Enzyme design. Structure first.
Site, PDB file in Angstrom:
ATOM      1  NE  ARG A 307      -4.194   1.209   2.338  1.00  0.00           N
ATOM      2  CZ  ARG A 307      -4.919   1.919   3.197  1.00  0.00           C
ATOM      3  NH1 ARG A 307      -4.323   2.694   4.102  1.00  0.00           N
ATOM      4  NH2 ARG A 307      -6.252   1.851   3.155  1.00  0.00           N
ATOM      5  CB  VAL A 309       0.342   5.700   2.718  1.00  0.00           C
ATOM      6  CG1 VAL A 309      -0.780   4.674   2.627  1.00  0.00           C
ATOM      7  CG2 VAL A 309       1.580   5.082   3.376  1.00  0.00           C
ATOM      8  CB  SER A 353      -8.403  -1.052  -0.428  1.00  0.00           C
ATOM      9  OG  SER A 353      -8.451  -1.621  -1.725  1.00  0.00           O
ATOM     10  N   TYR A 364      -0.202   6.449  -9.329  1.00  0.00           N
ATOM     11  CA  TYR A 364      -0.595   6.191  -7.948  1.00  0.00           C
ATOM     12  C   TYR A 364       0.439   5.306  -7.219  1.00  0.00           C
ATOM     13  N   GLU A 397      -6.215  -5.573  -6.534  1.00  0.00           N
ATOM     14  CA  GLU A 397      -6.672  -5.267  -5.161  1.00  0.00           C
ATOM     15  C   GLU A 397      -6.895  -6.505  -4.283  1.00  0.00           C
TER      16      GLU A 397
END
EC number: 2.4.2.-
Length: 433
Positions: A307, A309, A353, A364, A397
Site C-alpha cells: 500500500r 501512502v 484495500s 498512484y 486489489e
C-alpha cells in the site's frame, strides 16, 4: 533452429534461469521479427555500443512487470551473435530480476571489482584495456581512469553499470570471450567467477527459502494475477448478487461514505429526516454485505500485500512534514518516525484495500507517495482478491476485512535501483496484523 537457439540459453547455469523464472520471467524463441512478436519505433544498443532499430535486431530483453527475453532463431554457431544473447540475458538479470536488480550493483563486490578495473596499470602507465573492453561510451566520458566509483555514481548512472554487469556476464559465459575478460579485466572476471561458482546459487537458494515462509509477488504481475484469480475463484463463485455489487461499488462511489461511517463511529432519542435516514440505512446494508462477503474468505497462506501512502498515514499532525525533498528521503526524519512508531499499533476501522503487487500504477505509486507499506498478512486473516470486480482494472486489489489491528515492525530507506522508481527514493515501512 529453435533447438540450436534453445541449446544456447540452456548452456547458462540453471541458477540464473531459476532466478528469472521465479519473477515470472519468460523466454520466447521466434522465426518472426521481434517487433511482430505479441510481447512487443524503438532502438537498441548491442554489447559493443552499436545502435540498431529493434525490428532489425535478433534479441531483446523486455523489462517491467512481466519480463520477457525474445530471441530470434538463428543458427548461433557464430560467437558474435551468441554473445549478444548472453548480454541481453545479463541485462534481464541485473535490471529485471529481484533481488539482483535492487541489491547487486550497490554490493561491495561489484564496486570493488569495477574500481579495480578503473585502476589497472601497464608510476606504471595507466591501462585502459578493462575500460575499453567493458565500459560504454557515456561512462568513459563521465568516469576517468583512477576515479573512484561509489554508491552515488552508480545510482545516478544506473544503465551504464547494468551494461558493465551484463557485458561481464556475457563475456564470461561465452567461451571464446571468457579469456579476454580474464586477461583485460581480471577483477571483473573474478567477480563473475564467484557468482557462477557459488553466489548465483546462494542468492537463488535464499529466494526459495523466503518463498517457503511468505508469498510475495513484489511488482511482478504475471504470477500474482494467476494466483489471485485461481485461489479466490471458489469464494467469488459463492458471492450473492448483492455481495458482488457492493464489492464493485466499494471500488467506486460507495467508498467514501462507508469509510467515513466506519472511521466516525469506530466500527440516543433524536430522529433523522427521511433522506438522511434512507442514506444511513443503505450504507449499513452495504457494510452488512461486505462483512458477510469477506467473512466467507480466509487467506490460505502468509502473504505480503502493498500500500502506497503519504505522511498522513501517521496522523493529522504529520501534514506538511516533507519526508521527501527532491527525491532524497530525509534520514533524520525517518529516525523520528522509527522512534515514535516502531512496535506501536493502530486499529483500521474501515476495510483495508491493498495491492497484491507493489506499485501496479505509475500515477498512484512512487512519484506521488513517499511511503510503501509492506504488509504481512498471516494465514487465517479474512480478505480476498477483488481485482476482477473493480471499477478500476489493473490494480490487483486485495481487500482485507475491517477491524484488524496493525503493528509497525521496520523502517527501511530504499534507493532508486529501477527505472520504475523515477529517480526518487522512498521509505518502506513493514506492518503486520
Amino acid at each position: 533452429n529453435s533447438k540450436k537457439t534453445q541449446e544456447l540459453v540452456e548452456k547458462l547455469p540453471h541458477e540464473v534461469l531459476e532466478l528469472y523464472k521465479n519473477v515470472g520471467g519468460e523466454i520466447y524463441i521466434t522465426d518472426k521479427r521481434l517487433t511482430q512478436h505479441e510481447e512487443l519505433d524503438m532502438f537498441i544498443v548491442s554489447s559493443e555500443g552499436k545502435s540498431f532499430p529493434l525490428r532489425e535486431h535478433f534479441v531483446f530483453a523486455k523489462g517491467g512487470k512481466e519480463p520477457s527475453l525474445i530471441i530470434h532463431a538463428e543458427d548461433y554457431a557464430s560467437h558474435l551473435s551468441s554473445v549478444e544473447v548472453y548480454y541481453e540475458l545479463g541485462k534481464a538479470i541485473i535490471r529485471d530480476t529481484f533481488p539482483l536488480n535492487q541489491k547487486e550493483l550497490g554490493n561491495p563486490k561489484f564496486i570493488n571489482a569495477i574500481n579495480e578495473v578503473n585502476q589497472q596499470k601497464e608510476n606504471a602507465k595507466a591501462d585502459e584495456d578493462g575500460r575499453d573492453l567493458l565500459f560504454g561510451k557515456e561512462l568513459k566520458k563521465n568516469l576517468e581512469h583512477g576515479q573512484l566509483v561509489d554508491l552515488d555514481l552508480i545510482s545516478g548512472n544506473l544503465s551504464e553499470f547494468q551494461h558493465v554487469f551484463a557485458k561481464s556476464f556475457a563475456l564470461y559465459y561465452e567461451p571464446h570471450y571468457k579469456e579476454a575478460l580474464k586477461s583485460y579485466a581480471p577483477a571483473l572476471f573474478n567477480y563473475m567467477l564467484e557468482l557462477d561458482q557459488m553466489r548465483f546459487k546462494e542468492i537463488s537458494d535464499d529466494v526459495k527459502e523466503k518463498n517457503k515462509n511468505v508469498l510475495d509477488f513484489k511488482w511482478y504481475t504475471r504470477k500474482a494475477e494467476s494466483w489471485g484469480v485461481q485461489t479466490f475463484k471458489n469464494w467469488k463463485e459463492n458471492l450473492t448478487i448483492s455481495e458482488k455489487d457492493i464489492i464493485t461499488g466499494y471500488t467506486g462511489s460507495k467508498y467514501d461514505p462507508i469509510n467515513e461511517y466506519l472511521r466516525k463511529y469506530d466500527g440516543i432519542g433524536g430522529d433523522l429526516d427521511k433522506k438522511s435516514k434512507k442514506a444511513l440505512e443503505k450504507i449499513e446494508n452495504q457494510i452488512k454485505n461486505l462483512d458477510a462477503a469477506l467473512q466467507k474468505s480466509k487467506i490460505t497462506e502468509n502473504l505480503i500485500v502493498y500500500r502506497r501512502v503519504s505522511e498522513l498515514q501517521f496522523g493529522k499532525k504529520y501534514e506538511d512534514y516533507n519526508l521527501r525533498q527532491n527525491g532524497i528521503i530525509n534520514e533524520e526524519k525517518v529516525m523520528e518516525l522509527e522512534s515514535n512508531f516502531k512496535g506501536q499499533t493502530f486499529i483500521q476501522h474501515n476495510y483495508m484495500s491493498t495491492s497484491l503487487v507493489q506499485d501496479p500504477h505509475q500515477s498512484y505509486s512512487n512519484d506521488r507517495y513517499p511511503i510503501l507499506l509492506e504488509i504481512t498478512i498471516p494465514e487465517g486473516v479474512h480478505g480476498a482478491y477483488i481485482a476482477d470486480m473493480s471499477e478500476y482494472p489493473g490494480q490487483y486489489e486485495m481487500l482485507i476485512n475491517r477491524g484488524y489491528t496493525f503493528k509497525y515492525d521496520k523502517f527501511s530507506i530504499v534507493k532508486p535501483t529501477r527505472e520504475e522508481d523515477k529517480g526518487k527514493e522512498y521509505l518502506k515501512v513493514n506492518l503486520s496484523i
